[PDB]
Amino acid sequence: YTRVVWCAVGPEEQKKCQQWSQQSGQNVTCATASTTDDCIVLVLKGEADALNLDGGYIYTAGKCGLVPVLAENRKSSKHSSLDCVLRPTEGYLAVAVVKKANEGLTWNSLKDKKSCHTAVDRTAGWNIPMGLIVNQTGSCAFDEFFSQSCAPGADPKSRLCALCAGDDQGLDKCVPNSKEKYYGYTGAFRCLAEDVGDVAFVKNDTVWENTNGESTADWAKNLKREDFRLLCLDGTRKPVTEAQSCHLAVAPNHAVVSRSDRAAHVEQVLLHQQALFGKNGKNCPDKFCLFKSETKNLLFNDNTECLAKLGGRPTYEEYLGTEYVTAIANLKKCSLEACAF
Numbered sequence: 412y413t414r415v416v417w418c419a420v421g422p423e424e425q426k427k428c429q430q431w432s433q434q435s436g437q438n439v440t441c442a443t444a445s446t447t448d449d450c451i452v453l454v455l456k457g458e459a460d461a462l463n464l465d466g467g468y469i470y471t472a473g474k475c476g477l478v479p480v481l482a483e484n485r486k487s488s489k490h491s492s493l494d495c496v497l498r499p500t501e502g503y504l505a506v507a508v509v510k511k512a513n514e515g516l517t518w519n520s521l522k523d524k525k526s527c528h529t530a531v532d533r534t535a536g537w538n539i540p541m542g543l544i545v546n547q548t549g550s551c552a553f554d555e556f557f558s559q560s561c562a563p564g565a566d567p568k569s570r571l572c573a574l575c576a577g578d579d580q581g582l583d584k585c586v587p588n589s590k591e592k593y594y595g596y597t598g599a600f601r602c603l604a605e606d607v608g609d610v611a612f613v614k615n616d617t618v619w620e621n622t623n624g625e626s627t628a629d630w631a632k633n634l635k636r637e638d639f640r641l642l643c644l645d646g647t648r649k650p651v652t653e654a655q656s657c658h659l660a661v662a663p664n665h666a667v668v669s670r671s672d673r674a675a676h677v678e679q680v681l682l683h684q685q686a687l688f689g690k691n692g693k694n695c696p697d698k699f700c701l702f703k704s705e706t707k708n709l710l711f712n713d714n715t716e717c718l719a720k721l722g723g724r725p726t727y728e729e730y731l732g733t734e735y736v737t738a739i740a741n742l743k744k745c746s747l748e749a750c751a752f
């Protein structure tokens with residue numbers, strides 16, 4: 412069984428994946444697609460074995476029968492004696508960030524503002540905030556809530572893509588992959604940091620990893636945590652140090668999914684690959700680091716300490732949790748059960 416074919420979303424993840432391939436002795440090989448959904452399709456077809464996914468894509472993947480294999484585990488202090496690989500996942504905090512200088516902007520004053528989403532169908536950048544909004548406004552017209560937005564994956568012509576910038580040559584505007592300047596956690600935050608949008612829907616970690624010198628990237632260099640605030644659901648504004656108490660929801664960690672019949676082997680190969688390229692990987696610093704990508708979260712989030720065993724051999728609905736799964740169906744009622752491909 413020993414060859415695992417990873418699916419890369421976009422050319423940058425492709426470049427990284429090939430490096431990982433070369434270094435793995437072709438134990439890991441690559442397949443590329445322009446979107447996560449397409450990568451879900453190559454795995455369904457058996458042309459790729461796996462990829463790591465945000466919760467919202469796990470939902471889509473799971474309805475098609477794909478199963479969670481290993482979950483991303485970030486740097487947590489609590490539960491410190493257990494190996495990261497066997498450490499329960501704690502989840503991440505989906506937050507709404509704004510510029511402090513943008514005084515008076517609260518959760519209750521978001522209507523008609525400019526927003527930045529990681530990508531349509533993602534947990535923190537879309538399902539959480541939009542499900543909240545739809546719920547709160549009683550309307551399915553979330554395409555009309557923000558005056559303008561950058562929501563990779565939405566219709567390029569629509570105002571949900573208006574603030575997206577595309578790539579270096581302005582091409583691929585709004586594609587849900589790293590080619591789009593404002594794609595993902597980093598891109599949605601850069602979208603806010605450059606005042607292209609008024610609010611960014613990312614996770615707690617995003618704000619920290621890109622402020623106070625934590626990045627070096629041109630646009631982030633000069634960012635200071637105090638210039639940002641989190642919008643709490645109670646209409647309040649708190650510093651980005653108050654995430655445990657000012658968030659939209661806690662999200663299930665991004666996780667690797669593969670076809671049910673390939674899971675066991677994808678799991679085995681993966682644990683052996685992070686032992687080599689993970690946070691303490693034998694060859695990480697020197698040769699290759701699976702969880703680093705110049706701050707671009709390619710294939711995995713950069714703050715991933717390791718990929719952990721799941722426990723309860725959970726279904727995708729159990730891994731996402733009932734609370735989260737209800738939100739996504741209730742939100743998708745605006746677009747009853749079956750694989751979207």
Ligand SMILES: *[C@@H]1O[C@H](CO)[C@@H](O[C@@H]2O[C@H](CO)[C@@H](O[C@@H]3O[C@H](CO)[C@@H](O[C@@H]4O[C@H](CO)[C@@H](O)[C@H](O)[C@@H]4O)[C@H](O)[C@@H]3O)[C@H](O)[C@H]2NC(C)=O)[C@H](O)[C@H]1NC(C)=O
Pocket residue numbers: 539542543546733734737738739741742
């Ligand atoms: C948007 O608005 C909709 C409509 O209100 C939201 O949908 C509702 O979401 C909640 C999910 O938290 C859900 O309530 C649960 O109902 C379950 C049973 O019907 C309860 O299950 C029990 O939980 C116990 C432990 O907590 C456990 O002991 C027991 O075995 C069982 O698991 C559960 O506790 C909650 O009460 C509503 O059912 C759901 N409404 C429906 C059916 O549409 C949606 O989440 C809202 N928000 C977002 C973010 O989009």
Ligand SMILES: *[C@@H]1O[C@H](CO)[C@@H](O[C@H]2O[C@H](CO)[C@@H](O[C@@H]3O[C@H](CO)[C@@H](O)[C@H](O)[C@@H]3O)[C@H](O)[C@H]2NC(C)=O)[C@H](O)[C@H]1NC(C)=O
Pocket residue numbers: 486487488504615616617619620652654655714
């Ligand atoms: C919001 O996201 C932040 C980035 O992921 C994260 O920030 C920091 O918090 C954790 C601890 O809570 C630190 O983790 C480690 O803790 C050890 C043991 O005490 C420290 O010695 C060490 O510094 C280590 O990093 C992170 O360092 C730190 N992140 C950075 C780079 O600033 C928050 O935990 C997170 N959660 C919130 C605030 O809700």
Ligand SMILES: *[C@@H]1O[C@H](CO)[C@@H](O[C@@H]2O[C@H](CO)[C@@H](O)[C@H](O)[C@H]2NC(C)=O)[C@H](O)[C@H]1NC(C)=O
Pocket residue numbers: 413434435436437438
């Ligand atoms: C690719 O996978 C192969 C097969 O799993 C690896 O080779 C094994 O490495 C183990 C040590 O963990 C040795 O006992 C043997 O040499 C191999 N057989 C086993 C037990 O699988 C190898 O580590 C990987 N190659 C590269 C370049 O990473």
Ligand SMILES: O[C@@H]1[C@H](O)[C@H](O)CO[C@H]1O
Pocket residue numbers: 500501502503661662663664729730731732735
């Ligand atoms: O099921 C769990 C819970 O939903 C938690 O909030 C995060 O991680 C998921 O795997």
Ligand SMILES: O[C@@H]1[C@H](O)[C@H](O)CO[C@H]1O
Pocket residue numbers: 448471531532746751
């Ligand atoms: O890509 C599609 C669309 O975004 C849809 O709205 C939900 O199912 C996904 O697979």
Ligand SMILES: [Fe+3]
Pocket residue numbers: 465466533534535662665
């Ligand atoms: Fe996510």
Ligand SMILES: [Zn+2]
Pocket residue numbers: 658660661
């Ligand atoms: Zn909470």
Ligand SMILES: [Zn+2]
Pocket residue numbers: 723724725726729
């Ligand atoms: Zn179960």
